Amino acid sequence: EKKKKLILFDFDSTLVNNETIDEIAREAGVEEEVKKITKEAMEGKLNFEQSLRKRVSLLKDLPIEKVEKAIKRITPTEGAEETIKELKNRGYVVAVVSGGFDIAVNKIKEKLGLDYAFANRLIVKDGKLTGDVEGEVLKENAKGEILEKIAKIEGINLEDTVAVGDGANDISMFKKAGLKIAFCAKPILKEKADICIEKRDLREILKYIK
Ligand SMILES: [Mg+2]
């Protein structure tokens, strides 16, 4: 009869080792420029949505096959599946909320056995990226809105939620969460975290969760 907890994870650099957008940028020949903007966005120096639309536009015309080649290089962070299975083993609900893309996130949702997955989407036409991106994980308070929505669906009080993030777009998720864990995170998020983990193994979060 114990109560369930809801645990939300950020995708890029948290559940997986890579930054999806930077990997696709490599295939489009704009890795350096995109990497730089990604770093500023995660450090909180830029509005997230404007920074993402700017990086995605540099991907215009990339064939879908090259997008997949970049996605295939994405690997799960050390300890990811074991950690998710242990949380589910306790009866907890687990979700991934990402400013990244369904094309990468959908895969990991099934691979790791997550209950919820929210991400943006790359627009495609004639088998190539158009350079646009649309979705519900763009606005500054988007992740916090999703955390509240999932918690309501599950009947779980916000005090019983845990957010694990690593970038500035995880700040709104931290505002609503009962426990805030910064996983090998940028300074702007570490300032706001309850706990900061710097060892790159997702199982390290289990020590802090009953
Ligand atoms: Mg991240």
UniProtKB/Swiss-Prot annotation:
What this protein catalyses is: O-phospho-L-serine + H2O = L-serine + phosphate; O-phospho-D-serine + H2O = D-serine + phosphate
Which of this chain's residues are annotated to bind Mg(2+)? Answer: 10, 12, 166
Pfam family for this entry, one:
Hydrolase
What top-tier enzyme class does this entry carry? hydrolase
User: Mind telling me which GO cellular component terms the entry cites?
Assistant: cytoplasm
Which key words tag this protein in UniProt?
Answer: Amino-acid biosynthesis, Hydrolase, Magnesium, Metal-binding, Serine biosynthesis
**Record: residues binding substrate:** 19, 55, 98-99, 143, 169
GO terms, molecular function: L-phosphoserine phosphatase activity; magnesium ion binding
Q: Kindly tell me the pathway this chain contributes to.
A: Amino-acid biosynthesis; L-serine biosynthesis; L-serine from 3-phospho-D-glycerate: step 3/3
Q: Which InterPro entries does this one have? A: HAD-like_SerB (IPR050582), HAD-like_sf (IPR036412), HAD_sf (IPR023214), PSP (IPR004469)
> Which residues act catalytically here?
10, 12
Gene Ontology BP terms: L-serine biosynthetic process
- Cofactor binding annotation: Binds 1 Mg(2+) ion per subunit.
Necessary cofactors: Mg(2+)
Question: Is Metal-binding one of the keywords?
Answer: yes
Thermal profile, per the record?
Answer: Optimum temperature is 70 degrees Celsius.
Field pH dependence: Optimum pH is 7.5.
What effect on the protein does mutating residue 10 to N have, as reported in its record? Loss of activity
Enzyme Commission code: 3.1.3.3
The record's similarity note reads: Belongs to the HAD-like hydrolase superfamily. SerB family.
**NCBIfam families xref list:** HAD-SF-IB, serB
Q: What is this protein called?
A: Phosphoserine phosphatase
What organism is the protein native to?
A: Methanocaldococcus jannaschii (strain ATCC 43067 / DSM 2661 / JAL-1 / JCM 10045 / NBRC 100440) (Methanococcus jannaschii)
